[PDB]
Design a binder for this molecule. Sequence first.
Ligand SMILES: [Cl-]
Length: 331
Amino acid sequence: DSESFSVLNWDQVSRLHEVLTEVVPIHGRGNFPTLEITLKDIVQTVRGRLEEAGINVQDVRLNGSAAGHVLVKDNGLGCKDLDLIFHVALPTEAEFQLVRDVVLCSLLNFLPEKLKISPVTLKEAYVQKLVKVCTDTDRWSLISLSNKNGRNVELKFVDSIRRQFEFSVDSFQIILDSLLFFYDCSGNPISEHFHPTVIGESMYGDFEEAFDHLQNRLIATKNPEEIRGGGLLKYSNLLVRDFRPADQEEIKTLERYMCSRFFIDFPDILEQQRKLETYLQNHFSDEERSKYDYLMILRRVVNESTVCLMGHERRQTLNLISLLALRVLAE
Ligand SMILES: [Cl-]
């Protein structure tokens, strides 16, 4: 109900406007130039061309750390990743290809003025990753832009997705539809005296409770059973950023559960290595000290919250953590 929603104030709406209008460079591989895009322009292009092609855009939302930064300035979670969500129905395969073609066309809008241009070519030049699932329980397409700039622009087109786990401070989404309608129809720039009503939502459950957690830098969750192997990595990211567990005397039980879930999802040691290496690159680029501190946090949780039955997995994972941290110190 309304307990998960909240109305943004001018301070939050203003920072939302800066995030959507910030010029973000998108690195181009090869002879391709860097695209200077804004979240506002790419949303308007994608949503316009989607609805023009028969795909109704139910709503557009800002997700991730950016949504947290709009609610609380400099909360400690950073502002690298710009995550966008497009609630669109994807019944058949043709809708999935249409979503890709519209995104690649949106990149063509920012391409300045000799190169060969095509959908296959634009994907190679600017799309960092493109994952796609198409089952009865999950139907969503994700397109990420090149992150050699340092920032991660993710375009997530969700039809239906079973709820993913995140802590309170990472569960904020900002519905942009009222502000996008304002961008198209306003004759004056957005101001304190004239600005639309922007709504934020916490997928955690209670906005005020989650908002208080972000204001006091607290680690909390109400659905621990939905935690999978990645939960240990999200929890360690909050710890390295000076977020304290909001419920002491309970974190020991939660840390043990997160280590067990980590080992169940990643039994192979070579699988844990590739998961950490890609995690250290997509979260702590140009932050070698943060790479070391994150691994040392991860070592402390694994060393103190792994049961006696899994001593093999504990020693094996602790050794991998040390060798990854040693390679950071070796450079
Ligand atoms: Cl998880």
